[PDB]
Amino acid sequence: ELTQDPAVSVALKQTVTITCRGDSLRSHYASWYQKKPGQAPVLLFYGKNNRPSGIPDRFSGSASGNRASLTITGAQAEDEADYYCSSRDKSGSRLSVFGGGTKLTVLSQPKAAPSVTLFPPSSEELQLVCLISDFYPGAVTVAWKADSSPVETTTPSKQSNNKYAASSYLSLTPWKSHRSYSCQVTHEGSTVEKTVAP
Amino acid sequence: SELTQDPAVSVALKQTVTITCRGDSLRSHYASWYQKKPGQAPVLLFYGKNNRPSGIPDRFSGSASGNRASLTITGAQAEDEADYYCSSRDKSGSRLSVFGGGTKLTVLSQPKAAPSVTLFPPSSEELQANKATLVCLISDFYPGAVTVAWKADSSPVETTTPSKQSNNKYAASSYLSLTPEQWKSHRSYSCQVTHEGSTVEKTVAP
Amino acid sequence: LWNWFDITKWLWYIKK
Amino acid sequence: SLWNWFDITKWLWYIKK
Amino acid sequence: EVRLRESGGGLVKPGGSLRLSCSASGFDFDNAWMTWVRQPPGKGLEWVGRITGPGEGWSVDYAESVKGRFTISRDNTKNTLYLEMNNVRTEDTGYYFCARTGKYYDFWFGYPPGEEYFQDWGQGTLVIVSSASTKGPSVFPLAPGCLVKDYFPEPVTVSWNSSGVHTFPAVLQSSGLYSLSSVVTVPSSSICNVNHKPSNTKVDKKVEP
Amino acid sequence: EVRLRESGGGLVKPGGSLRLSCSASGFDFDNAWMTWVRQPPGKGLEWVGRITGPGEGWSVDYAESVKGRFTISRDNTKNTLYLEMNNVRTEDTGYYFCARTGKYYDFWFGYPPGEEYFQDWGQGTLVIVSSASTKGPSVFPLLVKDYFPEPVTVSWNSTSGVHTFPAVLQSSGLYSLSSSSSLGTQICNVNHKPSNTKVDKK
Numbered sequence: 001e002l003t004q005d006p007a008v009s010v011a012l013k014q015t016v017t018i019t020c021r022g023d024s025l026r027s028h029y030a031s032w033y034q035k036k037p038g039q040a041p042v043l044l045f046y047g048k049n050n051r052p053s054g055i056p057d058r059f060s061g062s063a064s065g066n067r068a069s070l071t072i073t074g075a076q077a078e079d080e081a082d083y084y085c086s087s088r089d090k091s092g093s094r095l096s097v098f099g100g101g102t103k104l105t106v107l108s109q110p111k112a113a114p115s116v117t118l119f120p121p122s123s124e125e126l127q128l129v130c131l132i133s134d135f136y137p138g139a140v141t142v143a144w145k146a147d148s149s150p151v152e153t154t155t156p157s158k159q160s161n162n163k164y165a166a167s168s169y170l171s172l173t174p175w176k177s178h179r180s181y182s183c184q185v186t187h188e189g190s191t192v193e194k195t196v197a198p
Numbered sequence: 199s200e201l202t203q204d205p206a207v208s209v210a211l212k213q214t215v216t217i218t219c220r221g222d223s224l225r226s227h228y229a230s231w232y233q234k235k236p237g238q239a240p241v242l243l244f245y246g247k248n249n250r251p252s253g254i255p256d257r258f259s260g261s262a263s264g265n266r267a268s269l270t271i272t273g274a275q276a277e278d279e280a281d282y283y284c285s286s287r288d289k290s291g292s293r294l295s296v297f298g299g300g301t302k303l304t305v306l307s308q309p310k311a312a313p314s315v316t317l318f319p320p321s322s323e324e325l326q327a328n329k330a331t332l333v334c335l336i337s338d339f340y341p342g343a344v345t346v347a348w349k350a351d352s353s354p355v356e357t358t359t360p361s362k363q364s365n366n367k368y369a370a371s372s373y374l375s376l377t378p379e380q381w382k383s384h385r386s387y388s389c390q391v392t393h394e395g396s397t398v399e400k401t402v403a404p
Numbered sequence: 405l406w407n408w409f410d411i412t413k414w415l416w417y418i419k420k
Numbered sequence: 421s422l423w424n425w426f427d428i429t430k431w432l433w434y435i436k437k
Numbered sequence: 438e439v440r441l442r443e444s445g446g447g448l449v450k451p452g453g454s455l456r457l458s459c460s461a462s463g464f465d466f467d468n469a470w471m472t473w474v475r476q477p478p479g480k481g482l483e484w485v486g487r488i489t490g491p492g493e494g495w496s497v498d499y500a501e502s503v504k505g506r507f508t509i510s511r512d513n514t515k516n517t518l519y520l521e522m523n524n525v526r527t528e529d530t531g532y533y534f535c536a537r538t539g540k541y542y543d544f545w546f547g548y549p550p551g552e553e554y555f556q557d558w559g560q561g562t563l564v565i566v567s568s569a570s571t572k573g574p575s576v577f578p579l580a581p582g583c584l585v586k587d588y589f590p591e592p593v594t595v596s597w598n599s600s601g602v603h604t605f606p607a608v609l610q611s612s613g614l615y616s617l618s619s620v621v622t623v624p625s626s627s628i629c630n631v632n633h634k635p636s637n638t639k640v641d642k643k644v645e646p
Numbered sequence: 647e648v649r650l651r652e653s654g655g656g657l658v659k660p661g662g663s664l665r666l667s668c669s670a671s672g673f674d675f676d677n678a679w680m681t682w683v684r685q686p687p688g689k690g691l692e693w694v695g696r697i698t699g700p701g702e703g704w705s706v707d708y709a710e711s712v713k714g715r716f717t718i719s720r721d722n723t724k725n726t727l728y729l730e731m732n733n734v735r736t737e738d739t740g741y742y743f744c745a746r747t748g749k750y751y752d753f754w755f756g757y758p759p760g761e762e763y764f765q766d767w768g769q770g771t772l773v774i775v776s777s778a779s780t781k782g783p784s785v786f787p788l789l790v791k792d793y794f795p796e797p798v799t800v801s802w803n804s805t806s807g808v809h810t811f812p813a814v815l816q817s818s819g820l821y822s823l824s825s826s827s828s829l830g831t832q833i834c835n836v837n838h839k840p841s842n843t844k845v846d847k848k
Contacts, residue, residue: 027757029750031764035691038438038463040743040770041683046763047750053366056277078255084691087761094409094707096681096762101690119788129789129824133809152814152822155688159809162252167811167824228541230554234482237647237672239561240534245554246541283482286552293426293498295472295553300481316620321584324577331577333584333618337603356608356616359479363603371605371618405599406701412751412758419754421468421492422804429542429549436545440769444651465799467837514839560649560769594674 001089002030002099009105009137010075018070018102020085027091030068032061033098035082044083045070072104080106105137112136112163116185118194121175128170130183130194132156138164143184200288201229201298206343209274211307219267219284219298226290229267231260234281234300243282244269271303279305304341311367313339313393317400320381330381332374334389334400336360342368347390439463441535441559448565448590453525457562459518459535466516467491470538472555473509473520477531478609485520487538487553502528525566532561565590569613573638576631581646582620583629588636595619596630647672650744650768657795660777662734668727668744668768676700676722679747681764682729686740687815694718694729696747696762734775741770778819782843785836792820793838800825801835 002022010016020030031046043052045061058073068085085099114135118128132140138156152171156164168183176198185192201221209215219229230245242251244260257278261268267284284298316335324330336344342360356375360368372389381387381404388401445457459471472487486499488509497509508521518535536558542551567589574588585593588607595604601622607615619629631640654666668680681696695708697718706718717730727744745767751760774795783793790798800810800823810825825834836845 029752029756029761031761033691033764035685038440040767041691041745041764042767043763043765046748047761048752048755050750052765053362054277056275076255078253082690086693086763092758094759095709096693096696098683098691098693122786122788125784125786125789125791131811131824152816154812154814154823157812158252165809165811167814169814169816169822171816226548228543228547228552230541230552232482232555237649239558240482240536240555241558242554242556245539246552247543247546249541251556281481285484285554287550291549293550294500295484295487297474297482297484318579318582318584318618321577321580324584327575327577331584331586331616333579333582335582335618335620337620337622356610358605358608358617361606369603369605371608371620373608373610373616373618375610408698408702408749409759412756412760415751415753416758421490424492424494425489425540426493426550429547429551432542432544432547433549442651462797465801467799 001097002085002087004085004099004102006100007103007105009107010072012077012106012108013074016072016075016104018072018083018104020068020070020099021066022087023066024088024091024093025063025068026066028088029063030061031086032059032070033084033086035084041084075104075106077106077108080104105139107137109136109162111188114140114185114187114192116183116192116194118183118196120196120198121172126174128172128181128196130168130170130185132166132168132185133159134161134163134165135187136163138166139187140166141184141186142166142168143186144168144170145182145184147178147180199299200296201284201286203284203298204301205299206302206304208304208306208341209271211305212273212275214270214272215274215303216261216271217269217282217301217303219269220265221267221286221298222265223287223289223292224262224265224267227287229260229262229284229286231258231269232283232285234283240283274303274305276305276307279303279307304343306341308340308366310394311338311340312396313337313344313391313398315389315391315398315400317389317402319402319404325378325381328378330376330378332376332387332389332402334372334374334391336371336391337363337369338365338367339369339393340367342370343393344370345390345392346372347392348372348374349388349390350384351386439537439557441537441557443533443535443559443562446533446562446564448567449525451525451527451566451568453566455522455525455564457520457522457533457564459559461516461518461535461537463557464537467513470540470553471511471518472536472538472553473518474534474536474555475529475531476534476561477528480531485533488518522564527566527568530564530566532563534561535559567613571636572614573636574631574633574640576629576640576642578642578644579618579620580644581623582618583631583642583644584618585631586616587614588616588633589614590635591615593617594632597621598628599630648746648766650746650766652742652744652768652771655742655771655773657774658734660735660775662775663730663732664734664773666729666731666742666771666773668729670725670727670744670746673746675725679749679762680720680727681745681747681762682718682727683743683745683764684738684740685743686737689740694742697727731773736775736777739773739775741772743770744768776819780840781820782838782841783836783845785834785845785847787847789824790836791822792816792818793822793841794820795840796821798823799835799837803833804835
C-alpha cells in the first residue's frame with residue numbers, strides 16, 4: 001500500500017527527500033516518524049503543514065497525487081535513522097498503516113577497507129564463521145561460495161572507533177566433501193574474498 | 199552544591215555560548231555534562247578530558263582550567279534549548295559525586311512577544327467564604343521568563359512556572375492569599391511583571 | 405463528545 | 421573488574437611520580 | 438540497546454516507607470556501577486548514591502542529606518537495582534532516576550579516585566510525600582475564568598460550556614494544597630466544568646459580570 | 647508532562663497468551679485515543695490497532711494480520727491501556743508501543759475520516775515468541791553457538807581491539823555471536839545468566 005525506497009544515502013549538509021507512494025495518499029495526508037535503534041519513534045510531520053514543537057525546522061513535508069515527500073534541509077549526523085510514512089490503508093477507511101521503511105544513511109567519515117576473516121570449523125566442534133570488521137558505511141554484501149558454486153548474516157553494528165562490523169555464519173554437516181569455501185564480501189564495488197580448506 | 203553554575207543563560211539562534219561550572223573539586227577532577235529536557239531522561243553530553251559519546255552533535259565541546267569547567271555549544275539550535283548540568287566529585291579524593299545547580303539555556307528562535315497582564319479582584323462569592331485570593335494573568339509572551347512582584351498600594355505569593363500555550367507562546371499565573379479584611383485595609387494591590395527589562399503593571403481596587 | 409466518524413462525514417457535506 | 425577501582429587510582433598516582 | 442525501567446513510585450505520608458526498583462538490560466549488569474539520582478519538582482538533579490561492582494566489595498556511598506535513611510542494593514540475577522526508603526521526609530519528593538555509572542581516570546592528569554559519569558539514564562519514577570489527604574476543590578468565578586483553589590490531589594480537568602481558553606499548571610502552595618486558574622479571553626461585546634476524580638467532585642460554575 | 651509505560655512483556659511460547667499494559671499520565675486520558683504499534687527485531691513498524699473515545703462508543707479497529715487473535719481495551723479509572731494477545735505465533739514477536747493518537751481532518755481538501763497521527767510514544771516492551779527454552783552455549787576456539795535466551799557477556803582475560811558482534815537468531819530458534827609476534831608468548835570469558843553457564847577457554 002504505502003511504498004517507499006528501502007535505503008537512501010545523503011552527504012553531510014546536503015538536502016535529502018524521502019518519498020512515499022500509495023493510492024490512499026490521493027485523498028489522505030501522511031505522517032512521518034523517525035526511528036532510531038533503542039529509542040522510541042518521534043512524530044516529525046503530519047497533516048497539511050504541521051511540525052510538532054521540538055523538531056528542527058529543516059523537516060518538512062509535501063503532498064501531491066499518490067505521493068508524499070519528507071524533505072530534510074541540511075542533513076546532520078543526528079539524522080541517520082529509520083523514517084516511516086503513515087496514512088490510511090484505503091481511501092475512506094478507519095485503518096492506519098505504515099510504510100516499508102527508508103534507512104537514511106548520512107555519510108560523514110571516510111570509506112574504510114572491510115577487514116574480512118574466515119575461520120574453519122574447529123576439530124572440537126566436529127567431535128564457518130566469516131567476520132567483517134573496520135568498514136564504512138555500514139553496508140556489505142555477503143555471498144557464500146562452495147568450491148566454485150554459490151546461511152546466516154548479522155546486521156552491521158557500531159564499533160569502538162565509530163566504524164561498523166558484521167559477521168556471517170554457514171551451517172553444515174561433518175564439510176569434508178568439498179575442497180574450499182569462499183566468503184564474498186562486497187563493499188562499494190570492491191570485492192574481498194577469504195577462502196578456507198579442510 | 200560544591201559545583202557553582204549559571205542559573206539562566208540566553209543565546210541567539212546559531213551563535214556560540216559557553217556554560218560555566220565552577221567548583222573547588224574541579225582543580226583535581228574532570229567534569230561531565232548532561233542535557234535535561236522537561237519530561238525526558240538526561241543525556242550524557244561530554245565527560246573525561248575530551249570524550250564525546252556517539253550520537254551527539256559535534257557542536258558540543260568541553261574545556262577546563264583551574265576550578266572552572268566549561269561546556270561550549272557552537273551555533274545553538276532550537277533543540278539545544280534545555281537544562282544543562284555539570285557533575286564531578288564533591289571533594290578532592292572523595293568517593294562521592296554531586297551535580298551543579300543547573301543552567302537554563304534559552305534559545306531565541308521565536309518572535310519575541312510582550313506579556314499580556316490581567317489582574318483579577320477577589321470574587322464576592324469567595325469573600326463570603328471568609329477567604330480572598332488575587333489572581334494575576336500573564337499570558338502570550340516569549341521567552342518564558344517573568345518577574346512577578348506584588349505591591350500593597352505602593353509598598354511591596356504563589357506563582358506558576360511559564361508553560362507552553364496553544365500558539366507556542368508562554369503563560370503563567372501568580373496568586374496572592376489575603377484575609378478578607380486585608381483586601382479592604384489597603385486602597386490598591388498591584389501585580390508587577392518584569393519581562394525583557396520592561397515592566398508592566400495592573401491594579402485593581404475594592 | 406460526538407462521533408468523530410460521524411462529524412467528519414457531515415463536514416464533508418457542508419462543503420458541497 | 422577483578423581489582424578494586426579505588427585502589428588502582430591510588431597507585432597510578434604513585435607511578436606518575 | 439540499553440534499557441532502564443524505574444517503577445514503584447507513588448504516594449506516601451512523611452515517615453512512611455517505600456521501595457523503588459530499576460530493572461536493567463542491554464549491558465553486562467553484574468560489573469556495571471549503578472546510581473540513583475533524584476530531582477525535586479522545579480529544581481535540579483541531586484546525587485543520591487551509587488553501588489559499586491564485584492571488585493569493590495559492592496560498597497555503597499550515600500549523600501549526607503540521605504545517610505542513615507535510604508539503602509541501595511542490587512539483585513544481579515534479576516538485573517534490578519533497589520532504593521529502600523525509610524523515614525521518608527517531604528523533601529524526598531521528586532523524580533528518582535537510575536543511571537549506568539561509568540568510571541574515568543586519566544593516567545597523566547587524573548587524581549584518585551578519578552571521576553564518575555552517568556552514561557545511560559532511565560525516564561524516572563515519581564515519588565510524592567505529603568501529609569494532606571483527599572480534598573475537593575472550591576471553584577470561585579472570575580468576573581470579566583474560574584479559580585479552582587483548595588484541591589488535592591492532582592489532577593483536575595477544566596472544560597468550558599461542556600479558543601482563547603488556557604488552563605495553567607497548578608501551584609503547590611505552602612499548605613500542601615494545589616491551586617490553579619482557567620481564564621478565557623472573550624470579546625467585550627459578548628460555564629466552566631471542573632472535575633476532580635480523587636474526591637469524585639464535579640462543579641459547573643457560571644461566570645457573570 | 648506526557649509519560650507512557652509499557653509493561654507485561656517477556657517470553658511466551660507459540661499458541662500461548664499474554665496481556666500487555668500501558669499506563670499513562672499527564673494529559674486527558676479519558677478522551678484521548680490510544681494506539682498499539684509493533685516492530686519486529688530489525689524490521690519496520692506495524693500498526694496493530696487503536697481504541698477510540700467516548701463519542702465513538704469506545705470502538706476498536708484491528709489490523710488484518712491481527713483480527714481474531716488480539717483484543718484492545720482500556721480502563722479510565724486506572725489510566726491504563728490493555729492489549730490481550732491470544733494464540734500467539736513467532737511472527738508477532740517485537741516491541742509493542744502505545745501511542746497517543748491525534749485526530750486530523752482538513753475541512754477543505756481532506757477526505758473522511760481524516761487521518762491518524764501518533765503524537766507521544768512509550769519506549770516499548772519486548773515480547774519474544776519462540777518454542778525454545780533455556781539452553782547453555784558452547785564455546786569453540788577460533789565461538790559461542792546455540793544458546794537461548796539472550797544475552798551472553800563475552801570478555802577476554804577476565805580490551806584494546808576487542809569487538810563482540812551482535813547475535814543472530816538461527817533457524818533452529820537459538821542464538822550465536824562472535825567476539826603476530828605475541829601469538830605464542832601470550833582467555834575468552836563466556837557467561838550465560840539464564841542457565842548459570844560460566845565457561846572460559848584459551
